[PDB]
Every structure is written in structure tokens, then in C-alpha cells.
Write a protein that binds this DNA or RNA. Structure first.
Length: 341
RNA sequence: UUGUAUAU
């Protein structure tokens, strides 16, 4: 299967082997764990001539290398370090194959790299081969990263077809493991006319989303980078449910984000809710201090509370200081209290 | 080591 040259190379016979020396063996070396490695760490520092010599032998069979466990790395280097003309010729070897490559283990990595370095016209042509297959790519283990990459790299205007495809399925995709990722990229890079409908659906299913294994990340994303209007809507869903949600493995993280990113008024209201409300005989704050997840919310509340409110929180915590030591999680609250005594 | 998500 291997040639004399590659054979002797594996056998560590050419410790000083150079690029020009493997002319006529590029494809063979490229599809070889050691060969590829060798080529990879030469193209970056090699000369334009050495790179063209390598390019000449991989252009025709480029697809073959793109979907190759070791070859995909060489093609990637050309997009990263190759010349404009080489990147363009590789982009043409990809034409008509975007979908199958995007769904490919190795191929999707080439597509992702190509999207970063080719011109907008080449990006738009690539993106368009995904037209009609958006959800399939989004739900694919390989394809979801190509979609994420398009959103990061391509002009928003050319991604309208991905937006049209998410309409009505935002809730479904936000609880999907790859989908929640694409939704976040959409919120960070797309246009107002595009993020608007996505946000409406996110607001409509906020209650379910905060508690979802994946949806909770999308809601936090909005609390951390969203417009104040959108943040307040999320906060108003949390209000009245601080106690119950802070005790939830998933929503607890969302109430922390609310505490941290709410407006001054909203923050005070959230903290007060658990400083006033009584959970049985003892306050809601006390039940929270003893919970495996809620204790984190209290600590965050102590951190962001205005000195006036922090004082109130400490006072509600005070009478319980000695009992807290007996609870697996209350203890952790004591630790936090050290920072303040 | 008090608590949740990405691929050769």
C-alpha cells in the first residue's frame, strides 16, 4: 500500500526530509498520519514555491483529502496559509459538495475553515448549497458547526434562509443540544428583523426554557447580551418564582443571571421577594440557604446587593448562623459569610 | 474540590 519513500519515512530514515523531496508523493503523504503531520508543519513556514509544489498534487484529488481522516488537515492549512488563488481553486473543488462535506466528520472542518478565509461571493455560494437543508444540518453532529460558522462569518443578509427555517421551531431548537448553539450565534450576529421573531418565541416559552437542560443556556445568553427590554421580560417570568426556580438544577443558573443583569429596581425586587416571603415557618431565604442549588443564588444575591439591601439580607441570615453549620449546603453559606465578617 | 451544554 505504501511506497518505498513513505515506507522509509515511517521507518524514521529521513529525519531531515524536506518538502521538495516528497514531490510526486504528496497525496500519499497527505493520507498518512505521519505524512500529513509532516506536511502540516511545513506549509506554515514553507516558501510560496514549496507550497505551490504541494498544491499542484492535491488540487485534483482535493475532495478525497477533505473527507480523509488525516488529509483534511492539509487542505485546512491551505485555507489558513495558502495563497488567494489556491484558496479560490480549492473553493471550486468544493462547489456542488457543500452539503455532503458539511455533514462529514472530516469534511465539515474544511467547510468551516473555508468560510473563514474565502471572499463573500464564495461564502454566499457555499451557504446557498445549504438552502433547503437547514434543519438537517442544524441537528447534525457535524453540520451544526458549519451552520454556526456561517452565522459567525457570513453577511447576515445571506443567512435569511436559516432564519426563515427557524421560525416556529425556536422552542424546539432551543431545547435541542446543537440547536441551542445555533440560536445563540443567531442572537449575536443576525439583524434586528431576524432576531426579533426568534426573541418573541423565546419570550413565549421562557417558563419551559429556563428549566430545560439546554434552553436554560439560551435564556442566560439573552440576560448576558440582550437588550434591556428582552431582559426585563425574562425577569418578569422569574418574579414570584424565585424560591422555586433557585432550587432547580437548571433554572437556578437563570435566576442568578437575573440577579446579576437585572436593572437596579428589578434586582431589589428579586432579592426582597425572598427576604419577605416565608417558606413555611422560616423565610424563603432560609430554605434557599439549605438547598444544593439555591445556596448559590443567595451567595450571588449577597454579592450584587446594594449595601442597604445586603444589610437586610445579612440580618435575615444572622439568626440561622449556628444552625447552618449542620447542613451540607448551609455550611457553604457560612464560608461566604467569612468574606463579610 | 457544594450545581448544567459543542464535534477529526
Amino acid at each position: 500500500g505504501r511506497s518505498r519513500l513513505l515506507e522509509d519515512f515511517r521507518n524514521n530514515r529521513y529525519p531531515n526530509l524536506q518538502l521538495r523531496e516528497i514531490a510526486g508523493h504528496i497525496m500519499e503523504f497527505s493520507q498518512d498520519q505521519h505524512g500529513s503531520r509532516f506536511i502540516q508543519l511545513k506549509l506554515e513556514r514553507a516558501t510560496p514555491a514549496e507550497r505551490q509544489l504541494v498544491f499542484n498534487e492535491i488540487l485534483q484529488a482535493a475532495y478525497q483529502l477533505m473527507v480523509d481522516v488525516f488529509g483534511n488537515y492539509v487542505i485546512q492549512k491551505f485555507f489558513e496559509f495558502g495563497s488567494l488563488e489556491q484558496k479560490l481553486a480549492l473553493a471550486e473543488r468544493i462547489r456542488g459538495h457543500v452539503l455532503s462535506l458539511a455533514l462529514q466528520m472530516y469534511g465539515c472542518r474544511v467547510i468551516q475553515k473555508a468560510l473563514e478565509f474565502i471572499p463573500s461571493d464564495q461564502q454566499n455560494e457555499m451557504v446557498r448549497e445549504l438552502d433547503g437543508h437547514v434543519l438537517k444540518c442544524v441537528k447534525d453532529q457535524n453540520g451544526n458547526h458549519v451552520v454556526q460558522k456561517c452565522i459567525e462569518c457570513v453577511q447576515p443578509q445571506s443567512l435569511q434562509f436559516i432564519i426563515d427555517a427557524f421560525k416556529g421551531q425556536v422552542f424546539a431548537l432551543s431545547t435541542h443540544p446543537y440547536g441551542c448553539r445555533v440560536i445563540q450565534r443567531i442572537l449575536e450576529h443576525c439583524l434586528p428583523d431576524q432576531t426579533l421573531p426568534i426573541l418573541e418565541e423565546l419570550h413565549q416559552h421562557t417558563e419551559q426554557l429556563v428549566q430545560d437542560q439546554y434552553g436554560n443556556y439560551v435564556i442566560q445568553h439573552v440576560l448576558e447580551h440582550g437588550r434591556p427590554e428582552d431582559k426585563s421580560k425574562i425577569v418578569a417570568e422569574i418574579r414570584g418564582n424565585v424560591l422555586v426556580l433557585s432550587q432547580h438544577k437548571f433554572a437556578s443558573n437563570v435566576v442568578e443571571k437575573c440577579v446579576t443583569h437585572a436593572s437596579r429596581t428589578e434586582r431589589a425586587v428579586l432579592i426582597d421577594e425572598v427576604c419577605t416571603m416565608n417558606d413555611g415557618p422560616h423565610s424563603a431565604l432560609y430554605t434557599m440557604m439549605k438547598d444544593q442549588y439555591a445556596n448559590y443564588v443567595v451567595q450571588k444575591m449577597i454579592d450584587v446587593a446594594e449595601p442597604g439591601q445586603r444589610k437586610i439580607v445579612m440580618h435575615k441570615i444572622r439568626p440561622h448562623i449556628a444552625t447552618l453549620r449542620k447542613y451540607t449546603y448551609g455550611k457553604h453559606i457560612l464560608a461566604k459569610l467569612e468574606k463579610y465578617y
